[PDB]
Scaffold this active site. Structure first.
Site, PDB file in Angstrom:
ATOM      1  CG  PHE A 209      -1.962   1.173   1.122  1.00 55.86           C
ATOM      2  CD1 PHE A 209      -3.139   0.869   0.346  1.00 55.86           C
ATOM      3  CD2 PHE A 209      -2.048   2.070   1.893  1.00 55.86           C
ATOM      4  CE1 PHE A 209      -4.324   1.535   0.310  1.00 55.86           C
ATOM      5  CE2 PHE A 209      -3.129   2.975   1.942  1.00 55.86           C
ATOM      6  CZ  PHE A 209      -4.229   2.664   0.977  1.00 55.86           C
ATOM      7  CG  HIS A 212      -1.918   6.382   3.332  1.00 50.50           C
ATOM      8  ND1 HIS A 212      -0.822   5.304   3.248  1.00 50.50           N
ATOM      9  CD2 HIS A 212      -2.557   6.216   4.614  1.00 50.50           C
ATOM     10  CE1 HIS A 212      -1.068   4.541   4.204  1.00 50.50           C
ATOM     11  NE2 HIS A 212      -2.087   5.055   5.044  1.00 50.50           N
ATOM     12  CG  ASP A 214      -3.792   7.097   8.887  1.00 48.90           C
ATOM     13  OD1 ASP A 214      -3.428   6.674   7.670  1.00 48.90           O
ATOM     14  OD2 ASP A 214      -3.718   6.473   9.749  1.00 48.90           O
ATOM     15  CG  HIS A 268       1.696   5.697   7.603  1.00 45.17           C
ATOM     16  ND1 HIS A 268       0.895   6.944   7.690  1.00 45.17           N
ATOM     17  CD2 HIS A 268       0.657   4.927   7.463  1.00 45.17           C
ATOM     18  CE1 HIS A 268      -0.410   6.817   7.840  1.00 45.17           C
ATOM     19  NE2 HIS A 268      -0.513   5.585   7.647  1.00 45.17           N
TER      20      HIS A 268
HETATM   21  C1  LIG Z   1      -1.907   0.930   7.679  1.00 47.82           C
HETATM   22  C2  LIG Z   1      -3.135   0.362   8.218  1.00 47.82           C
HETATM   23  C3  LIG Z   1      -4.068   1.244   8.975  1.00 47.82           C
HETATM   24  C4  LIG Z   1      -3.775  -0.263   6.928  1.00 47.82           C
HETATM   25  N1  LIG Z   1      -4.289   0.732   6.073  1.00 47.82           N
HETATM   26  C5  LIG Z   1      -5.599   0.930   5.993  1.00 47.82           C
HETATM   27  O1  LIG Z   1      -6.629   0.706   6.369  1.00 47.82           O
HETATM   28  C6  LIG Z   1      -5.821   2.289   4.903  1.00 47.82           C
HETATM   29  C7  LIG Z   1      -4.773   3.243   5.084  1.00 47.82           C
HETATM   30  S1  LIG Z   1      -4.652   4.060   6.642  1.00 47.82           S
HETATM   31  N2  LIG Z   1      -7.188   2.889   5.034  1.00 47.82           N
HETATM   32  C8  LIG Z   1      -8.058   2.979   4.149  1.00 47.82           C
HETATM   33  O2  LIG Z   1      -8.125   2.323   3.091  1.00 47.82           O
HETATM   34  C9  LIG Z   1      -9.405   3.603   4.849  1.00 47.82           C
HETATM   35  C10 LIG Z   1     -10.384   2.741   5.053  1.00 47.82           C
HETATM   36  C11 LIG Z   1     -11.664   3.629   5.578  1.00 47.82           C
HETATM   37  C12 LIG Z   1     -12.852   2.662   5.945  1.00 47.82           C
HETATM   38  N3  LIG Z   1     -13.299   1.891   4.750  1.00 47.82           N
HETATM   39  C13 LIG Z   1     -14.135   3.661   6.194  1.00 47.82           C
HETATM   40  O3  LIG Z   1     -14.923   3.556   5.814  1.00 47.82           O
HETATM   41  O4  LIG Z   1     -14.012   4.081   7.272  1.00 47.82           O
HETATM   42  C14 LIG Z   1      -3.351  -1.351   6.384  1.00 47.82           C
HETATM   43  O5  LIG Z   1      -2.753  -2.331   7.212  1.00 47.82           O
HETATM   44  O6  LIG Z   1      -3.181  -1.425   4.942  1.00 47.82           O
HETATM   45 FE   LIG Z   2      -2.687   4.663   7.076  1.00 51.46          FE
END
Ligand SMILES: CC(C)[C@@H](NC(=O)[C@H](CS)NC(=O)CCC[C@H](N)C(=O)O)C(=O)O
Ligand SMILES: [Fe+3]
Length: 329
Positions: A209, A212, A214, A268
């Site tokens: 990933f 980005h 958060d 991150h």
């Molecule tokens: C880094 C972690 C937090 C995790 N990343 C993630 O979950 C990534 C980046 S923080 N986050 C997202 O895609 C946002 C999800 C929002 C969720 N559907 C909602 O509707 O609230 C990973 O392990 O990829």
């Molecule tokens: Fe994140």
């Protein structure tokens, strides 16, 4: 090669108590971490993370393709026009490794006024069949309130760190309207691992990933003990060491907005690692109409010229932008 980030372990237990000086000492440590790499581990948090990981594993490993279609968000099932956030996010064999299940405030029911009004970002959770997954919904709803409680306490620490009264953020973080979500993410072991699921960063690192910030006020993350995260600093990316007893905490971009970037949202990314693991974030979001007036802690008077931003508009735009930039998860 790659250096390791300084990620302190902070005992947050005083934040649940009434010793005000001890709370200030925690706040100082939160401030210091927030001004350095932006990450810290919360320890002595009181959450049974062993049960969390076990119950999440049992779900991910026992759910079948039929159930995944029935729970799928709109991106994977055109019949589910009302599931933008909550539901299952399918893997694509041979192409996309990660899968996850996202759920929102258990208090969002058909009866809830934000649901009646069809306000964006509010949805009613979808759940698997209780007979196929006994106890799962009960565990997951309980967990939401357990991590809500920890997050409330952390928000008191952040308020004190910034020179505000301890309820400055927490007063907007309410069980009746919080837009907070839990995501139960499975990163699988795969052999061969699909090349389409691996991204190559500019610096050559293989990623799951991309970089980005958060979309959250803060992010409260449990992960199993497999190193994967990196934080950007001016001198490059640094590895964050894993700790499967603690919660990893960082600020999101709403905190950066309201502090005039005094507490930045750290950039991150997630390195590719071929290992079965869990990533269980709780995104601390406020209510749809919540607005906090921005301030600048660097100024004697705290004056900021930044516009107040409604949390709901921030979240709607932020979630879409993250999909557009880093892909549908
Ligand atoms: C880094 C972690 C937090 C995790 N990343 C993630 O979950 C990534 C980046 S923080 N986050 C997202 O895609 C946002 C999800 C929002 C969720 N559907 C909602 O509707 O609230 C990973 O392990 O990829
Ligand atoms: Fe994140």
């Amino acid at each position: 090669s790659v250096s390791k980030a300084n990620v302190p372990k902070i005992d947050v237990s005083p934040l649940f108590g009434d010793d005000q000086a001890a709370k200030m000492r925690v706040a100082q440590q939160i401030d210091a971490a927030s001004r350095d790499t932006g990450f810290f581990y919360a320890v002595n948090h009181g959450i049974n993370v062993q049960r969390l990981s076990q119950k999440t594993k049992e779900f991910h490993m026992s759910i079948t393709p039929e159930e995944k279609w029935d729970l799928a968000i709109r991106a994977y099932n055109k019949e589910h026009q009302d599931q933008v956030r909550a539901g299952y996010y399918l893997s694509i064999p041979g192409k996309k490794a990660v899968e996850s299940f996202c759920y929102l405030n258990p208090n969002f029911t058909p009866d809830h006024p934000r649901i009646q009004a069809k306000t964006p970002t509010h949805e009613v959770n979808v759940w698997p069949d209780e007979t196929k997954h006994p106890g799962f919904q009960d565990f997951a709803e309980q967990y939401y309130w357990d991590v809500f409680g920890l997050s409330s306490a952390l928000l008191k620490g952040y308020a004190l760190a910034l020179g505000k009264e301890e309820n400055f953020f927490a007063r907007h973080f309410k069980p009746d309207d919080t837009l907070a979500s839990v995501v139960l993410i499975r990163y699988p072991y795969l052999d061969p691992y699909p090349e389409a699921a691996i991204k190559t960063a500019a610096d050559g690192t293989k990623l799951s990933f991309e970089w980005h910030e958060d979309v959250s006020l803060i992010t409260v993350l449990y992960q199993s003990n497999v190193q994967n995260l990196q934080v950007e600093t001016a001198a490059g990316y640094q590895d964050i060491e894993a700790d499967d007893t603690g919660y990893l905490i960082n600020c999101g971009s709403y905190m950066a907005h309201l502090t005039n970037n005094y507490y930045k949202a750290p950039i991150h990314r997630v390195k590719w690692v071929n290992a079965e693991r869990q990533s269980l974030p709780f995104f601390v979001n406020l209510g749809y109409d919540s607005v906090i007036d921005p301030f600048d802690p660097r100024e004697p008077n705290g004056k900021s010229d930044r516009e107040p931003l409604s949390y709901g508009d921030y979240l709607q735009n932020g979630l879409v932008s993250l999909i557009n930039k880093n892909g549908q998860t």
